[PDB]
Design an enzyme around this catalytic site. Structure first.
Site, PDB file in Angstrom:
ATOM      1  N   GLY D  30       0.823  -1.239  -0.016  1.00  0.00           N
ATOM      2  CA  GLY D  30      -0.282   0.057   0.050  1.00  0.00           C
ATOM      3  C   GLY D  30       0.688   1.309   0.048  1.00  0.00           C
ATOM      4  O   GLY D  30       2.078   1.225   0.040  1.00  0.00           O
ATOM      5  N   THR D  31       0.149   2.428  -0.014  1.00  0.00           N
ATOM      6  CA  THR D  31       0.578   3.635  -0.004  1.00  0.00           C
ATOM      7  C   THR D  31       1.418   4.091   1.421  1.00  0.00           C
ATOM      8  O   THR D  31       1.300   3.227   2.506  1.00  0.00           O
ATOM      9  CB  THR D  31      -0.544   4.750  -0.072  1.00  0.00           C
ATOM     10  N   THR D  32       2.097   5.052   1.557  1.00  0.00           N
ATOM     11  CA  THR D  32       2.948   5.213   2.431  1.00  0.00           C
ATOM     12  C   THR D  32       2.403   6.309   3.269  1.00  0.00           C
ATOM     13  O   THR D  32       1.939   7.325   2.944  1.00  0.00           O
ATOM     14  CB  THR D  32       4.538   5.932   2.166  1.00  0.00           C
TER      15      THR D  32
END
Lengths: 241, 198, 243, 244, 233, 242, 111, 244, 250
Positions: D30-32
């Site tokens: 996923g995104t950070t």
């Protein structure tokens, strides 16, 4: 709490548990039903895997759901009891609310429905049973003969058979039953029945039980002798040629 | 209340039950048969709360018939009454109790003797030579106590009942429009279609 | 067939692999702990390992305060440990409410052991990968140490150790007692009992400890509290002036 | 044998629970997103990949608030994250209803912890496909937390998760070192904006949109609020400047 | 691999994927195309209705949830019914209880949370339908895209289904243009039809094959079918 | 094994697909819509000369303005019809009017996907999908005469004509050419009667086939054998007529 | 003891003309001897060319009217925007009302 | 999910057979043999105690002959524990019937009910069938002396003489060879012992390994009596019949 | 959540075996040995206190538990399963008996109760049989003294003397040789101690051996006086000391 879908579709569009329920029917003792012009007769063969029974008490194959309707079957005995019970209760309930005993069709439609339900309900397997339901509608003299199977399907017949070797006996009936002139006598109706069972029972005076159902709750089961007499007169029809 | 009389003679049980069905100020029917046949040899008469009365009767009848089918056998009069008492005894402590009183008269084909059971809505059962529910007993028991004899014939019984019904027609305030009489014996149940002047 | 290893059912040898594997999980944190009994107190020592610098050291613990009197240290993954701790606290409170007195250490242990035994028999519940060491100064039994495992087993000890190098810690303690000929640290102050705990801990593991390598809990009459980095330092300093 | 990684609550022979671990993979993928604890509050920031020009800018908000003082941000399966916040909201509402005082960050963390840990006990459920950074200001301080699918969680000085978690952690560690006395909310905001920009290199292929929120006893009154307009731009620029 | 990890939604693959969900997503792509786009005053839904035989009807793709909100489906029709219905209730509830029209953004959150529930529990199956929700609320026109995964995004325009990519590119291009089609519905619809035909290939949008829905400032979500969409083909 | 409500990699529901396979084995059933009424026809297909052909009920009445034909596992359809009849009747009780054919159909299809072993969404207690498709035909003042095809998938389509069962792909092809917006009821009848004859393994006679229609005037009626018998004769003639 | 009902007075009239119909009602809403409002509309337009009024106990009246209008709304959702004929509306309302047969909407309603 | 570990105890074999029932029956086949022979003046129940030790207390034991009613008794073959569960519900049923009708429960009625219970575990529940077969010996004023037999499938039948458990085949043949309608209890008692004596897998047939029970209507009374023989009473009858 | 394991986990195998029960027994066979002996005026049950560490306090772990003041039990197999069984047993003794008849259940019935509990764990949905075997000894006014054995199958039987666990085969043999129907309680205790010695590898003393008896009433262990009919419990667990004194006369 257990609801695992046991009866489900397979890739070819079949429901194996129902198909297998049928396999249990094939193995059950034969059962036959023929309708006369003023009666219906139910015949069933008696196994011989073990003989030393007490016929008086050993559960009989033909059952009365009410005083004017009977039901015979082929398949797992234990399973048949459950259906017969429900049928008998629905019979009394129907009289209680409609103030009129069930018609043969109705009672058949009920049993069939029960069966069909067990083919698409979780946690339960279909009934390993097939049934012949015969009798006379109230205040009606036209005979009725129906049949049901694990799938839940049902339909009426002029004569029909279920159980082991029903294949054979059906043939006999298919080439021995003229709808044009159905057995116009209780006697000739019962004879045709025994004749069909003899095709598969292989000499079994004690291996064949007949029950005759007439209009207005006139139901009676024959005794060894009565039946034995029909057999005797039939073996002569053969030898006299 | 309605009249429910019962008398057990030598070889049968006779049940007399009024024919009137009054609702408020009007007598809606004068030909009511306050009885149900539970089995070929067992008859049950009943009196009580408007709807419950029949509902209960038919409920019991249905169950007995079902038993008969299942076991291809006719429960003894005694058995049937014990089943009925249990039903009423349950109904008494239920949300809405069946306010019904019954008389069960049957012929025990195995004992070859007639039996008369009296059971009130509380599930109070007792067996008698003759019984009645409600006020009916008050007017008739002195007569029955007097003329009752175990060996009476079915004809003597009807005569005694007729006497009772007359005392009832004389001293009782309400017009119950006469009664319907039935005999239960070794040969089943039949109705004395001629008591309007017997 | 082969699924007799995914759920708590018997293997043909009569084993319950899932329980065994759960036992394995208990060492996953790679931390050792031990408990010993003073004259009138109970001490639990546990290694404290904070690798990530971004972590807030003060929120890293495996020693819990179940009740005013019960203290519980856990060997195993924190989530299961916190689960166990919560349940234990709840059980302790309720027991007081229903019976009018503080739940005894051994009882809370039995209760937790029983709960674990259930996961052992019922197939939908998995065991908790932890080993719980309960301590306190019971009002009837005095200093008490009771520990349970994922098997549902439990018992009391004079002292005990848990973790990867549990065996060394144990034999170390075993020896000291065969020597002293008593079942406890004959000391009047818990400070010294704590010092003893930390000492024998070092000998067994063969390691030096700073004030941020340990975690200490102490149980006394009517109370169970954990020491601070500074309360620890004090302990470490004292042992020092002896070696 | 094998198959230990098909059912959720099963223990593999080495005491692990693969399904949980597999869940993490969803998180890493996923995104950070990050969390910075300052001297009187906390700051949350997250990377919002702009898949196209069609996405209405500023509209698809990812950071969520619990009660009026807690901020939550997660990486991984968005829906699972919302689901968790939903629970956290009920969790907090119940607490305030009975105790009157809004739920303390630590207490709140455990609530989410217990709940998530719960989804690793039965095989009839799936573990949470997210790691959540959350925190806020309460009766005695500011707290920053990070929760894993295993249910595990700890208090942090700084925390990051998602694609570029390593970059972030690295950057966060620098800050910890270069500010032993403590960062300020104002500072943390910018600093966070930077770290998101840096950590965006493990995703440099796609364009993104920054998002920051903060909870400062002095800057927001202890209430969680989103950094919008000027204060935001100021941080974007501060980053865009040090990205070169 | 996959085969051992796609028997149900409750299982994660070793790489962190939920195939059952991904499979659901697939059902969307197989479904007929539909497009959504908005200006600052209106929101339009253009859909291509598919038909079985030339004797069968062209299945409806647009469902109205309230006077200010509606959506188009792509995939399992039944699921759209289930979901759109649940959306209708949520609107109804908001109005009855708070006398407040449901915010499009809010409707999206609910839809997401409802879908998510079928992706973490044993026994269920993910919804197998994609949805495009448009609506005009207290903050103007809106367009949402719903994926059974539970992911709902707010866009200026988009499309889902087969060849949907055609229109999606076209829109990504015509952005600056249509986003300014304020005060003129006809134009937005035309700009919509033009985006959808960018995903055709089999046939050409006919009268009983095209389906359009609109909502905005002074326009209660209404659906145009057949003859009604003639002036756009 | 595998869940009963699982998705195939191609985004389809196994139990549902397999369901359609069983339908394929079912007796042929055909429906033709016309501005004069809708005709429903079915292949009795008894399994033995001893079976009384008129006890084969594959065409039933739901209401006076709605009738339907089945195909596939017919026992599965009983409860579907009970639900349909109840819906129609119930609708009338609440609204003092006739239920719209479309609505009735939608109601039936609603049962379709209510299967599984614990699908989170309500209480869908039904171990498997229905193994029967249905041709629902009727009339209502809003959309005149209508013919619908309800599948176990839950989706239903409206057709000007449609054929389901063993001879479907074939019969359907026929209908494709034979159907036009101006057919008459008699044309439709003969037409159904013809296509049935082509796909039926047996030689269509008034005993192994059954017709029926529904017209605004007299509602739904099933053609008795004598009525059909003649319609068959009339067809034999018009066919031998070229 | 708590009494769930109240009386807001007022009166309504409904007359049907050969090709029209009217439903009037005063706009006064009271409690005992006080006036709560000189203007609180009592007759409502519910769509599909239907006007309804449930006079009597205000709370119950509003609940019904609210419930009916919402019944109209769902009628459209469930039957392709079909118009709800007056006769159908009425039969619908009979059920709405009889539904609370043992805790009645203390109102006399006309449409 | 769970489905993985579900045996599905209630499905049909492709041959239309019930796996579990069949297997359970196989289980039964290894259980001590039990015999029931019905004479004109009474019924005889005889059973062979499977496995024994010197220390086993035989006076306090009863693993195969259980009393259900004062007129009904059963001989067990299979899981003792399972049997008891059933025996108890059997006993309650008898009493309910009594309380409801003020008449003892007709033998078949009781037998059927118990049989239906078994049938249940056969069609639904996902539970394993009871590994038990019963021989019912009882009397009622409608059919008098009756002998029934029920197995795990839920089926039951009537007999003049029958056996259940081990070597039923051998046993049935021996009984079918020397059974006569006009038999007398004392004749049956003997026939029974002889049959068991020739089927036993053990050295000899000693009293310590047998349970005996008879249901006669002692002429000097006029009522039905059940007599479960005591160790001493079996040792006797064992010598007398000449088996010492 | 929700236990979706509603089906049996114990089923019949083609051979007719019930695997889980079989395996359960296997688990019992690994368990430390325990035994029981019935004398003319009492019963004795004993087992080995296999301390799994010298740091552990073996006292704080009773393998011999009291069920009612006249009934005690001991096992061989899985301790945790035994523990819960004891709790369940003690309770069922009240709920299904004392709270009805005002008196404690007679040995055979309580046993029957415990057996039922085990049987159900052999058939109920989602569970495994208990992994233990029990030897319960008690005494009730109408049946005197008795000793029973309860297996995981739920089956039970009465014994004059027997052993279970690790070395049951050997122990049973040694018991047959020394048992007679004229033993006085002490004799059996003596014989118990001897029989147990063979099964013990290391230390054999009142601290490694746990032993209890069911004999005469101990009014001194009643806790109150004044009610003649109440004379005290027949169940008494021997003290570490009481065991050693008898070990000297070994």
């Amino acid at each position: 709490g257990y609801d695992r879908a046991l009866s489900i579709f397979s890739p070819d569009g079949h429901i194996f548990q129902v198909e297998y329920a049928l396999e249990a029917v094939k193995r059950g003792t034969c059962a036959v039903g023929v309708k006369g012009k003023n009666c219906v007769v139910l015949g069933c063969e008696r196994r011989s895997t073990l003989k030393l029974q007490d016929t008086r008490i050993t559960p009989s194959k033909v059952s009365k759901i009410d005083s004017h309707v009977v039901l015979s079957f082929s398949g797992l005995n234990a399973d048949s009891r459950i259906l017969i019970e429900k049928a008998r209760v629905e019979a009394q309930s129907h009289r209680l609310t409609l103030e009129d005993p069930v018609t043969v069709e109705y009672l058949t439609r009920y049993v069939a429905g029960v069966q069909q339900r067990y083919t698409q309900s979780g946690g339960v397997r279909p009934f390993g049973v097939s049934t012949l339901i015969a009798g006379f509608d109230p205040r009606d003299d036209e005979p009725k003969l129906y049949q049901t199977e694990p799938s839940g399907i049902y339909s009426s017949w002029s004569a029909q058979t279920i159980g082991r070797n029903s294949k054979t006996v059906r043939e006999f009936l298919e080439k021995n039953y003229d709808r044009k002139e159905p057995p116009a006598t209780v006697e000739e109706c019962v004879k045709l029945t025994v004749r069909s069972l003899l095709e598969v029972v292989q000499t079994g005076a004690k291996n064949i039980e007949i029950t005759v159902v007439k209009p207005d709750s006139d139901i009676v089961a024959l005794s060894s002798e009565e039946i034995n007499q029909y057999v005797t007169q039939i073996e002569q029809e053969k030898q006299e040629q | 209340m309605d009249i429910i009389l019962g008398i057990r003679v030598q070889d049968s049980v006779i049940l007399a039950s009024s024919k009137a069905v009054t609702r408020g100020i009007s007598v809606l029917k004068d030909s009511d048969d306050k009885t149900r046949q539970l089995s070929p040899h067992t008859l049950m008469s009943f009196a009580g709360e408007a709807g419950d009365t029949v509902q209960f009767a038919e409920y019991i009848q249905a169950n007995i018939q079902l038993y008969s089918i299942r076991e291809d056998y006719e429960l003894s009069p005694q058995a049937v009454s014990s089943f009925v008492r249990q039903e009423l005894a349950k109904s008494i402590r239920s949300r809405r109790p069946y306010q019904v009183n019954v008389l069960i008269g049957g012929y025990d084909k195995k004992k070859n003797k007639p039996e008369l059971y009296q059971i009130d809505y509380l599930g109070t059962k007792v067996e008698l030579p003759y019984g009645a529910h409600g006020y009916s007993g008050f007017y008739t028991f002195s007569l029955l106590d007097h003329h009752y004899r175990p060996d009476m014939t079915t004809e003597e019984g009807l005569d005694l009942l007729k006497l009772c019904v007359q005392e009832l027609e004389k001293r009782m305030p309400m017009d119950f429009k006469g009664v319907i009489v039935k005999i239960v014996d070794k040969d089943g149940i039949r109705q004395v279609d001629d008591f309007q002047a017997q | 067939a082969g699924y007799d290893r995914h759920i708590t059912i018997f293997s043909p040898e009569g084993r319950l692999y899932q329980v065994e594997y759960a036992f394995k999980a208990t060492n996953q944190t790679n931390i050792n702990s031990l408990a010993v009994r003073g004259k009138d107190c109970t001490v639990v020592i546990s290694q404290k390992k904070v690798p990530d610098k971004l972590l807030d050291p003060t929120t890293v613990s495996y020693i819990f305060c179940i009740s005013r009197t019960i203290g519980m240290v856990v060997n195993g993954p924190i989530p299961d440990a916190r689960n166990a701790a919560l349940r234990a606290k709840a059980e302790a409170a309720e027991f007081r409410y229903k019976y009018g007195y503080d739940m005894p250490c051994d009882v809370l242990a039995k209760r937790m052991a029983n709960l674990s035994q259930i996961y052992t028999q019922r197939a939908y519940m998995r065991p908790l990968g932890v080993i719980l060491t309960f301590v306190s100064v019971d009002e009837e039994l005095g200093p008490s140490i009771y520990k349970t495992d994922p098997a549902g087993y439990y018992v009391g000890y004079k002292a005990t150790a848990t973790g990867p190098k549990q065996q060394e810690i144990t034999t170390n303690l075993e020896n000291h007692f065969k020597k002293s000929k008593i079942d406890h640290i004959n000391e009047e102050s818990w400070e010294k009992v704590v010092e003893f705990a930390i000492t024998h801990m070092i000998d067994a593991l063969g390691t030096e400890f700073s004030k941020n390598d340990l975690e200490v809990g102490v149980a006394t009459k009517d109370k169970f509290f954990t020491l601070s980095a500074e309360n620890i330092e004090e302990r470490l300093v004292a042992i020092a002036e002896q070696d | 044998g094998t198959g230990y990684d098909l059912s959720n609550s099963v223990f593999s022979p080495d005491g692990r629970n693969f399904q949980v671990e597999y869940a993490v993979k969803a998180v890493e993928n996923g995104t950070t997103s990050i969390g910075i604890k300052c001297n009187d509050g906390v700051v949350f920031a997250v990377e919002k990949l702009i898949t196209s020009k069609l996405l209405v800018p500023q509209k698809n908000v990812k950071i969520q608030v619990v009660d009026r003082h807690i901020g939550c941000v997660y990486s991984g399966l968005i829906p699972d994250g919302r689901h968790l916040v939903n629970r956290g909201r009920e969790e907090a509402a119940s607490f305030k209803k009975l105790y009157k005082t809004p739920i303390p960050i630590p207490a709140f963390a455990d609530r989410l912890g217990q709940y998530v840990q719960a989804h690793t006990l039965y095989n009839s459920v799936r573990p949470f496909g997210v790691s959540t950074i959350f925190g806020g200001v309460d009766k005695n301080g500011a707290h920053l937390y990070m929760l894993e699918p295993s249910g595990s969680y700890w208090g942090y000085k700084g925390a990051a998760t998602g694609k570029g978690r390593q970059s972030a952690k690295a950057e966060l560690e620098k800050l910890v070192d270069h500010h032993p006395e403590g960062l300020s909310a104002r500072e943390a905001v910018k600093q966070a904006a930077k770290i998101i920009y840096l950590a965006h290199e493990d995703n440099k292929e796609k364009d993104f949109e920054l998002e920051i929120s903060w909870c400062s006893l002095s800057e927001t009154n202890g209430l969680h609020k989103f950094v919008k307009g000027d204060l935001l731009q100021e941080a974007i620029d501060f980053a865009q400047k040090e990205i070169n | 691999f996959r085969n051992n990890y796609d028997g149900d939604t409750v299982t994660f693959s070793p790489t962190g994927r939920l195939f059952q969900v991904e499979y659901a997503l697939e059902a969307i792509k197989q479904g007929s195309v539909t497009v959504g786009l908005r200006s600052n005053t209106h929101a339009v839904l253009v859909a291509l209705k598919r038909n079985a035989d030339e004797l069968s009807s062209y299945q409806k793709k647009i469902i109205k949830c309230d006077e200010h909100m509606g959506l188009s489906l792509a995939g399992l029709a039944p699921d759209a019914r289930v979901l759109s219905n649940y959306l209708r209730q949520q609107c109804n509830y908001s109005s009855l209880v708070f006398n407040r029209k449901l915010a499009v953004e809010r409707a999206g959150h609910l839809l997401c949370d409802k879908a998510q529930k079928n992706t973490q529990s044993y026994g269920g199956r993910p919804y197998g339908v994609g949805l495009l929700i448009i609506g005009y609320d207290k903050s103007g026109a809106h367009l949402l895209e719903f994926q059974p995964s539970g992911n709902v995004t707010e866009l200026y325009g988009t499309a889902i289904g087969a060849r949907s990519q055609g229109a999606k590119t076209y829109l990504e291009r015509t952005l600056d243009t249509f986003i300014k089609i304020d005060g003129n519905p006809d134009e937005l619809i035309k700009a919509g039809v033009e985006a959808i035909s960018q995903s055709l290939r089999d046939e050409s949008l006919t009268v009983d094959n095209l389906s359009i829905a609109i909502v905005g400032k002074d326009t209660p979500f209404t659906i145009y079918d057949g003859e009604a969409v003639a002036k756009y083909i | 094994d595998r869940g009963v409500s699982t998705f195939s990699p191609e985004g389809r529901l196994f139990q549902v697909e397999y369901s359609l396979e069983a339908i394929k084995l079912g007796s042929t059933a055909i429906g033709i819509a016309t501005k004069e009424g809708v005709v429903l026809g079915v292949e009795k297909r008894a399994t033995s000369p001893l079976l009384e052909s008129d006890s084969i009920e594959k065409i039933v009445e739901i209401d006076r303005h709605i009738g339907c034909a089945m195909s596939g596992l017919t026992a599965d359809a009983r409860s579907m019809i009970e639900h349909a009849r109840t819906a129609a009747v119930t609708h009338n009780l609440y609204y003092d009017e006739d239920i719209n054919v479309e609505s009735l159909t939608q109601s039936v299809c609603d049962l379709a996907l209510r299967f599984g072993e614990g699908a989170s969404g309500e209480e869908r207690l039904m171990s498997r999908p229905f193994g029967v498709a249905l041709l629902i035909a009727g009339h209502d003042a809003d959309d005149g005469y209508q013919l619908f095809h309800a599948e176990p998938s839950g989706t239903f389509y409206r057709y000007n004509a449609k054929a389901i069962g063993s001879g479907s792909e074939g019969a359907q092809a026929e209908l494709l050419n034979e159907w036009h917006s101006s057919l008459t009821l008699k044309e439709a009848e003969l037409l159904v009667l013809k296509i049935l004859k082509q796909v039926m393994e047996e030689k269509l006679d008034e005993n192994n086939a059954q017709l029926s229609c529904i017209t605004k005037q007299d509602g739904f009626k099933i053609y008795d054998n004598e009525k059909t018998a003649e319609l068959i004769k009339e067809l034999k003639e018009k066919e031998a007529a070229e | 003891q708590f009494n769930p009902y109240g009386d807001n007075g007022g009166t309504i009239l409904g007359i049907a003309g050969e090709d029209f119909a009217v439903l009037a009602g005063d706009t006064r809403n009271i409690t005992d001897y006080s006036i709560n409002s000189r203007y609180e509309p009592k007759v409502f337009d519910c769509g599909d060319n239907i006007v309804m009024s449930a006079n009597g106990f205000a709370a119950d009246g509003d609940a019904l009217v609210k419930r009916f209008k919402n019944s109209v709304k769902w009628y459209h959702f469930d039957h392709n925007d079909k118009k709800l004929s007056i006769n159908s509306a009425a039969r619908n309302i009979q059920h709405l009302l009889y539904g609370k047969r043992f805790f009645p909407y203390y109102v006399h309603t006309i449409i | 999910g769970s489905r993985r570990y579900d045996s599905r105890t209630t499905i049909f074999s492709p041959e239309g057979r019930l796996y579990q029932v069949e297997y359970a029956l196989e289980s039964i086949s290894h259980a001590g043999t039990a015999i029931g022979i019905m004479a004109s003046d009474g019924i005889v129940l005889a059973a062979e105690r499977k496995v024994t030790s010197t220390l086993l207390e035989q006076d306090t034991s009863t693993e195969k002959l259980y009393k259900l009613n004062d007129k009904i008794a059963v001989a067990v073959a299979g899981l003792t524990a399972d049997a008891e569960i059933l025996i108890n519900t059997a006993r309650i049923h008898a009493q309910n019937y009594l309380k409801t009708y003020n008449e003892d429960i007709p033998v078949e009625i009781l037998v059927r009910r118990l049989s239906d219970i078994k049938q249940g575990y056969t069609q639904h529940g996902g539970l394993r069938p009871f590994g038990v077969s019963f021989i019912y010996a009882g009397y009622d004023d409608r059919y008098g002396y009756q002998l029934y037999t029920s197995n795990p499938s839920g089926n039951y039948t009537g007999w003049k003489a029958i056996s259940v458990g081990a070597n039923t085949s051998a046993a049935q043949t021996l009984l079918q060879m020397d059974y006569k309608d006009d038999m007398k209890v004392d004749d049956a008692i003997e026939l029974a012992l002889k049959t068991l004596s020739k089927t036993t897998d053990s050295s000899a047939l000693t009293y310590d390994r047998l349970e005996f029970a008879t249901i006669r209507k002692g002429a000097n009374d006029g009522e039905v009596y059940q007599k479960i023989f005591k160790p001493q009473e079996i040792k006797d009858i064992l010598v007398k019949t000449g088996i010492t | 959540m929700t236990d979706r394991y509603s089906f049996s986990l114990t089923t019949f195998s083609p051979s007719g075996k019930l695997g889980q029960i079989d395996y359960a027994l296997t688990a019992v066979k690994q368990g430390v040995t325990s035994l029981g002996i019935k004398a003319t005026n009492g019963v004795v049950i004993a087992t080995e206190k296999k301390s799994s560490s010298p740091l552990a306090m073996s006292e704080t772990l009773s393998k011999v538990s009291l069920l009612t003041p006249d009934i005690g039990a001991v096992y061989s197999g899985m301790g945790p399963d035994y523990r819960v069984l004891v709790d369940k047993s003690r309770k069922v003794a009240h709920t299904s008996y004392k709270r009805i008849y005002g008196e404690y259940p007679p040995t055979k019935l309580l046993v029957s109760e415990v057996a039922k509990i085990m049987q159900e764990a052999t058939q109920s949905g989602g569970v495994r049989p208990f992994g233990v075997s029990l030897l319960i000894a008690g005494h009730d006014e109408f049946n005197g003294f008795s000793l029973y054995q309860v297996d995981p199958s739920g089956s039970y039987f009465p014994w004059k003397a027997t052993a279970i666990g690790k070395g049951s085969v050997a122990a049973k043999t040694f018991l047959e040789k020394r048992w007679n129907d004229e033993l006085e309680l002490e004799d059996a205790i003596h014989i118990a101690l001897l029989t147990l010695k063979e099964s013990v590898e290391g230390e054999f003393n009142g601290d490694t051996i746990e032993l209890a008896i069911i004999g005469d009433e101990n009014p001194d262990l009643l806790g109150y006086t004044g009610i003649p009919t109440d004379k005290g419990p027949r169940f008494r667990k021997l003290t570490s000391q009481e065991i050693n004194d008898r070990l000297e006369a070994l």
